[PDB]
Amino acid sequence: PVYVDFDVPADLEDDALEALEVARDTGAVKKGTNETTKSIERGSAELVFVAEDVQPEEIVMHIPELADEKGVPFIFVEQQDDLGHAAGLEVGSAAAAVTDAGEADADVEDIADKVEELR
RNA sequence: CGAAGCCCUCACGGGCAAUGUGGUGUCAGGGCUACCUCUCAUCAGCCGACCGUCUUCACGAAGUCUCUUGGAAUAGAGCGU
Ligand SMILES: [Mg+2]
Ligand SMILES: [Sr+2]
Numbered sequence: 001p002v003y004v005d006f007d008v009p010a011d012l013e014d015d016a017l018e019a020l021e022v023a024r025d026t027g028a029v030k031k032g033t034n035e036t037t038k039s040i041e042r043g044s045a046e047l048v049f050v051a052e053d054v055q056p057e058e059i060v061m062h063i064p065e066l067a068d069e070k071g072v073p074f075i076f077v078e079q080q081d082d083l084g085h086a087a088g089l090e091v092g093s094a095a096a097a098v099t100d101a102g103e104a105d106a107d108v109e110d111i112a113d114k115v116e117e118l119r
Numbered sequence: 120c121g122a123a124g125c126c127c128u129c130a131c132g133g134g135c136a137a138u139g140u141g142g143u144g145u146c147a148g149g150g151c152u153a154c155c156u157c158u159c160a161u162c163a164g165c166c167g168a169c170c171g172u173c174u175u176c177a178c179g180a181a182g183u184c185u186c187u188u189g190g191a192a193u194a195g196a197g198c199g200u
Contacts, residue, residue, distance in 0.1 A: 032137030035121070059138050084137075089122090093137055 002057055003050075003064050006119050008076045012111070016075050017086040019107045020049065020096065024088050027102025031087040033059055036095040037066070045072045047108050049096040051080040060094050073112040 008016075023029050030039050039045035040063070048067055054060045067074045077083045084092035101108045 032121075032139060034139070035137075054138075056138080089137065091136060
């Protein structure tokens with residue numbers, strides 16, 4: 001909520017999580033806020049995901065400002081458990097990162113372009 | 120590094136854990152990269168006392184002889200261990 005500056009539509013979120021499911025079975029993904037943060041700093045992150053139901057908000061707070069100065073695109077997911085299942089975990093995830101997509105590079109590029117049109 | 124982990128249960132199965140279980144590491148700084156050599160340090164775990172001290176216990180030598188006094192010798196004198 002405090003780190004959220006734009007609302008992402010349910011349709012765009014469906015596209016995003018589907019692209020993440022095929023990113024783990026082909027390319028490579030980073031699961032968890034610590035690994036997502038290191039990906040943005042190292043530059044290896046292509047697209048970063050962030051949950052909106054994170055309590056406390058401090059865990060994720062830095063991602064929207066850190067990604068802006070590193071050129072890495074970010075998208076908001078409504079639920080924590082949906083992002084965790086999409087990353088391939090039994091538990092939830094506050095943040096996920098796509099470190100070089102696989103056979104979804106065209107979809108990821110479009111998601112990154114649809115988010116910029118939504119500010 | 121990133122699920123490689125932990126708890127419950129005979130098992131099955133369940134719970135925990137990416138908001139990080141677990142590995143690494145902790146100022147002789149450490150990590151990472153490139154190498155030299157090596158370990159007996161440390162940490163985890165198995166085994167597991169001696170001696171001493173405190174207390175309790177077993178065993179454990181040699182007269183119940185003479186006389187006098189006395190209610191009674193454990194006294195005096197004498198002999199003996
Ligand atoms: Mg350790
Ligand atoms: Sr959770």
